[PDB]
PDB file of C-alpha atoms in Angstrom:
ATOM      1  CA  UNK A   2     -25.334 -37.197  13.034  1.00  0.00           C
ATOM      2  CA  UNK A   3     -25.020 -33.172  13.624  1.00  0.00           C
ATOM      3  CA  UNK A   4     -27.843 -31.674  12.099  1.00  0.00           C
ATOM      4  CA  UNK A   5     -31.382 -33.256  14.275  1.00  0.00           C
ATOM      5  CA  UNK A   6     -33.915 -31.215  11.984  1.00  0.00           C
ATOM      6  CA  UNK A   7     -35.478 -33.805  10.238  1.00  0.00           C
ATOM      7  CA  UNK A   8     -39.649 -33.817  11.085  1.00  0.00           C
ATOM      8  CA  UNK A   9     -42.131 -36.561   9.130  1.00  0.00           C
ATOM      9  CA  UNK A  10     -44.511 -34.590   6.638  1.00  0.00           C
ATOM     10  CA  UNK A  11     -47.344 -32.343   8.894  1.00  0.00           C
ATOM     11  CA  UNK A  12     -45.119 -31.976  11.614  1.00  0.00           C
ATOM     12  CA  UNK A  13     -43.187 -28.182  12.072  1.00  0.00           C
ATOM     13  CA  UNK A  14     -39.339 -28.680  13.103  1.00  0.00           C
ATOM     14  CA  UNK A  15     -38.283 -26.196  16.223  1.00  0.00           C
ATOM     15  CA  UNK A  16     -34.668 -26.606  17.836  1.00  0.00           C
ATOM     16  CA  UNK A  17     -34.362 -30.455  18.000  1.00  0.00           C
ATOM     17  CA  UNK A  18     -38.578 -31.338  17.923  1.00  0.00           C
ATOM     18  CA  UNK A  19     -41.380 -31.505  16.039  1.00  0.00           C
ATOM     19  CA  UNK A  20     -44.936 -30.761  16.539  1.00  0.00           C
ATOM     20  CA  UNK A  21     -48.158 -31.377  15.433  1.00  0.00           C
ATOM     21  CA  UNK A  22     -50.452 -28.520  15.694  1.00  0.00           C
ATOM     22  CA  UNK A  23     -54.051 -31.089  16.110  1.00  0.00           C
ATOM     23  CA  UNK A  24     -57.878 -29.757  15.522  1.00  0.00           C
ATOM     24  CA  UNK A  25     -60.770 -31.299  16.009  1.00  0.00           C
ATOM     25  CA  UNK A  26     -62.813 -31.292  19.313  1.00  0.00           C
ATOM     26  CA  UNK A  27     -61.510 -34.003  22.014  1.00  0.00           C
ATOM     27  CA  UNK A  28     -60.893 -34.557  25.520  1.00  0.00           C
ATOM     28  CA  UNK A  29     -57.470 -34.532  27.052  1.00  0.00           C
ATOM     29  CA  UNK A  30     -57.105 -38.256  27.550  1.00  0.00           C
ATOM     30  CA  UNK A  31     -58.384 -38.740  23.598  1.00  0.00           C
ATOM     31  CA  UNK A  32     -55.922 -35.885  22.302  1.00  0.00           C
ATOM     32  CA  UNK A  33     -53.586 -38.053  24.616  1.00  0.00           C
ATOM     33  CA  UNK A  34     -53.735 -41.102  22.545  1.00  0.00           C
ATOM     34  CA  UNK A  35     -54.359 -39.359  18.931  1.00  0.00           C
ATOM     35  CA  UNK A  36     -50.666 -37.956  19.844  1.00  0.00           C
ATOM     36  CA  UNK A  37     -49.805 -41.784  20.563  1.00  0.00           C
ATOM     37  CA  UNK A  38     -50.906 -43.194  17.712  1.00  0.00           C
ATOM     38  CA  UNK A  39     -48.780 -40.731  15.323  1.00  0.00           C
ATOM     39  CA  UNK A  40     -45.878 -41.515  17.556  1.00  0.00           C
ATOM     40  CA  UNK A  41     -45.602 -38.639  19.324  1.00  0.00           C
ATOM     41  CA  UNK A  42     -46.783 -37.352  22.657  1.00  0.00           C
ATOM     42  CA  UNK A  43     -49.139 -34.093  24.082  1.00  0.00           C
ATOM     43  CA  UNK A  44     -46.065 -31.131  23.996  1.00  0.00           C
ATOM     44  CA  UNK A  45     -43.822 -30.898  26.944  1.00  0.00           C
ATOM     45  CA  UNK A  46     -42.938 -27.228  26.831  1.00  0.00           C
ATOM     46  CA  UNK A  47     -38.913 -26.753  28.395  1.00  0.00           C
ATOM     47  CA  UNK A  48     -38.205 -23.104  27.646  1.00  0.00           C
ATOM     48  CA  UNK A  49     -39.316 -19.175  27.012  1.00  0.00           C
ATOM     49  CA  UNK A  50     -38.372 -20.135  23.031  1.00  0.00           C
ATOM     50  CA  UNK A  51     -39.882 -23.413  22.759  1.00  0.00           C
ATOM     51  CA  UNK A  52     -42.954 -21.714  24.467  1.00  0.00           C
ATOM     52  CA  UNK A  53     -42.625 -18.230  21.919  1.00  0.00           C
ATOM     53  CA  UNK A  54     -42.612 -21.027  19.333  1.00  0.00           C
ATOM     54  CA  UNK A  55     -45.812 -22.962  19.945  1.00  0.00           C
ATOM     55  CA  UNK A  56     -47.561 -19.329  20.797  1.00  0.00           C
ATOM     56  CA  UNK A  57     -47.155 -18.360  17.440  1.00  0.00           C
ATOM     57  CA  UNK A  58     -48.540 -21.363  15.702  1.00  0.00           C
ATOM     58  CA  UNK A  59     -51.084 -21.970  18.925  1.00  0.00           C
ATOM     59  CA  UNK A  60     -55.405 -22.373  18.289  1.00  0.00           C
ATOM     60  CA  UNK A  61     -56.800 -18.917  19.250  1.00  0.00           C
ATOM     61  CA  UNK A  62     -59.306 -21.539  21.144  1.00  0.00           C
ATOM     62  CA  UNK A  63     -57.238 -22.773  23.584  1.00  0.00           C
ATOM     63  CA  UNK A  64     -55.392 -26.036  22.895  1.00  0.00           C
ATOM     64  CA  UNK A  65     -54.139 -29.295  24.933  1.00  0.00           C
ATOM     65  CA  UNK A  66     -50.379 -29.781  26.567  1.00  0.00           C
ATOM     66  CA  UNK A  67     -48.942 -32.710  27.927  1.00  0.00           C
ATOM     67  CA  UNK A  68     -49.212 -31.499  31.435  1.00  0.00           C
ATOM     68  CA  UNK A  69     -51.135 -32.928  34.287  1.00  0.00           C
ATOM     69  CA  UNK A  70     -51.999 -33.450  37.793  1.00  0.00           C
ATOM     70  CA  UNK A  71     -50.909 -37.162  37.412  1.00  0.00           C
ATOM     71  CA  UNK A  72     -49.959 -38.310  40.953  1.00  0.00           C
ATOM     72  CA  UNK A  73     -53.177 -36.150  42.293  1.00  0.00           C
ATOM     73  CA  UNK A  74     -51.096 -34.478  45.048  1.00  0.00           C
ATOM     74  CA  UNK A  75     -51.063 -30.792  43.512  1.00  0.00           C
ATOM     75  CA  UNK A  76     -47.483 -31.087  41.479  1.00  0.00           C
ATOM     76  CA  UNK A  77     -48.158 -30.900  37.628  1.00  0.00           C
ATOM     77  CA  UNK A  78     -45.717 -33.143  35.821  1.00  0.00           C
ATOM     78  CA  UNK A  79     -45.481 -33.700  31.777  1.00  0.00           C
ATOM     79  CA  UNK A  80     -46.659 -36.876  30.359  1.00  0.00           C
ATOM     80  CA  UNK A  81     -43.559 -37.535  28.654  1.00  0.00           C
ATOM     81  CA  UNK A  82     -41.878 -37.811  31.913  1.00  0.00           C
ATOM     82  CA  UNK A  83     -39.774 -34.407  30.941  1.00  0.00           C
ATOM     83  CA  UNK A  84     -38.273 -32.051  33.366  1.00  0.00           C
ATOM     84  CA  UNK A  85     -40.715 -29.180  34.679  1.00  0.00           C
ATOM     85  CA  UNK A  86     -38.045 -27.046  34.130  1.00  0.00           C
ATOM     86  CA  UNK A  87     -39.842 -23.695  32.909  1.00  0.00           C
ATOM     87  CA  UNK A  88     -43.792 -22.636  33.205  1.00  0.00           C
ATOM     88  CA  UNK A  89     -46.055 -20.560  31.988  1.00  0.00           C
ATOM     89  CA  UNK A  90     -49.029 -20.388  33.894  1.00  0.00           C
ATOM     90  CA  UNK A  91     -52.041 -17.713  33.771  1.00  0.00           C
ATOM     91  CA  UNK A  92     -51.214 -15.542  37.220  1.00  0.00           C
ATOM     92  CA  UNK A  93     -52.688 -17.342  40.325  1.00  0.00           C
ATOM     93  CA  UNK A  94     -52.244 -20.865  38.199  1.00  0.00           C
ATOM     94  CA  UNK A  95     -52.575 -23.237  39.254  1.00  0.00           C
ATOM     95  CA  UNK A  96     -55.276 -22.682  42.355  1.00  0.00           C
ATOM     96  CA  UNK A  97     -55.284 -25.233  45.358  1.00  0.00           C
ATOM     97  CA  UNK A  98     -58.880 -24.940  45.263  1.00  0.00           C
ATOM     98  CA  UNK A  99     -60.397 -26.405  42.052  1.00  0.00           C
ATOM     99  CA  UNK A 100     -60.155 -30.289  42.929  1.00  0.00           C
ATOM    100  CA  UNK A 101     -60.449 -32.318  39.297  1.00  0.00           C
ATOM    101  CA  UNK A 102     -59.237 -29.945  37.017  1.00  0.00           C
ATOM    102  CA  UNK A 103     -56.010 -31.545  36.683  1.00  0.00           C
ATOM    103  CA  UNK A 104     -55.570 -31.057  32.862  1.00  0.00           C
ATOM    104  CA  UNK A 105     -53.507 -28.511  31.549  1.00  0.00           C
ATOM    105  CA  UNK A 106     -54.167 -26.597  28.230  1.00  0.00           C
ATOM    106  CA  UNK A 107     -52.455 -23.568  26.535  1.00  0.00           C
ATOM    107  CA  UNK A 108     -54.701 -20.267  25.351  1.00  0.00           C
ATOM    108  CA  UNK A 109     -54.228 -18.134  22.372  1.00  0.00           C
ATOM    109  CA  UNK A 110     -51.838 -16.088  24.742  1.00  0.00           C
ATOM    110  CA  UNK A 111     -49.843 -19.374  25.261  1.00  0.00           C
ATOM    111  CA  UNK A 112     -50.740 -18.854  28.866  1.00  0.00           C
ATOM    112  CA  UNK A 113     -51.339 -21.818  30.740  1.00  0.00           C
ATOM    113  CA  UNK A 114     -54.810 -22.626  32.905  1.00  0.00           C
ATOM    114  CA  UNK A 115     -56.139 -26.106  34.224  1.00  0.00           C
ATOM    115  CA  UNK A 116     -59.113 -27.781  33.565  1.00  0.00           C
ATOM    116  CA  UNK A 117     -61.163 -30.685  34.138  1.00  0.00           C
ATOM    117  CA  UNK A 118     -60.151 -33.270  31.997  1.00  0.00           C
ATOM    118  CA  UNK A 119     -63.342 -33.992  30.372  1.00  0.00           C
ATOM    119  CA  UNK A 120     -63.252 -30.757  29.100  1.00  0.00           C
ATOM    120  CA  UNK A 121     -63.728 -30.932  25.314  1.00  0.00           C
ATOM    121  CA  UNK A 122     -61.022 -28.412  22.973  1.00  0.00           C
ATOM    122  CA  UNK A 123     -60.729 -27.694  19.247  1.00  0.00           C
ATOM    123  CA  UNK A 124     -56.940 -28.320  19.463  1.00  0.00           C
ATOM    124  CA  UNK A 125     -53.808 -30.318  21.038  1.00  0.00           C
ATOM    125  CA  UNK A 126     -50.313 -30.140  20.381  1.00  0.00           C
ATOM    126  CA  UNK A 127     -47.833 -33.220  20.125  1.00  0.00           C
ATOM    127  CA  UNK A 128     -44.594 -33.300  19.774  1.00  0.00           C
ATOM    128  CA  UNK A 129     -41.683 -35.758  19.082  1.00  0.00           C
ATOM    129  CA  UNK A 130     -37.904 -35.864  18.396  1.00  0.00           C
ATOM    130  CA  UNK A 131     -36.228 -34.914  15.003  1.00  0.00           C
ATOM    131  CA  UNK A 132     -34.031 -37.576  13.340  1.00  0.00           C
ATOM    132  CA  UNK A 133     -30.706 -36.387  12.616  1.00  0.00           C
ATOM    133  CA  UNK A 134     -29.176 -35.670   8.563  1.00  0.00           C
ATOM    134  CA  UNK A 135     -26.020 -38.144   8.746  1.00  0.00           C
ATOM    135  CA  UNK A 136     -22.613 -35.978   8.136  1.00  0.00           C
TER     136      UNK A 136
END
């Protein structure tokens, strides 16, 4: 009902989400579908807080968003279908010039850079909606 700040065990509740801070070495289309199967998909990141948030429990190794160069044009959409409503790319991100790299990932900074997709990272982020306590 009011309260939506209910997260499955493993996942970390923030406003009305919750995420799943992954390891283990993959690719962005397998970190894609590992987020998937736990019924959840790669973070869609809507605001300075959300992003404060995931910098703070973030890989120091660079992790996975939901974020990519899906209709391969130039215009980085989330995966979730979400709003691009706030970003937080690296300075001079992303470049015109670096055909392929249509991934996006987050460093330990929570700055975002592309990459090429086949690109393999110790970390990914999902994220999914909380369920609501009824009043």
């Amino acid at each position: 009902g009011f309260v939506c700040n209910t997260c499955p065990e493993k996942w970390i509740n923030f406003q009305r989400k919750c995420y799943y801070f992954g390891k283990g070495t993959k690719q962005w289309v397998h970190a894609r579908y590992a987020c998937d199967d736990m019924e959840g998909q790669l973070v869609s990141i809507h605001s300075p807080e959300e992003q404060d948030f995931l910098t703070k429990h973030a890989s120091h190794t660079g992790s996975w968003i939901g974020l990519r160069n899906l209709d391969l044009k130039g215009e980085f959409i989330w995966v979730d279908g979400s709003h691009v409503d706030y970003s937080n790319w690296a300075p001079g991100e992303p470049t015109s010039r670096s055909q392929g790299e249509d991934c996006v990932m987050m460093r330990g900074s929570g700055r975002w850079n592309d990459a090429f997709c086949d690109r393999k990272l110790g970390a990914w982020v999902c994220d999914r909606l909380a369920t609501c306590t009824p009043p």
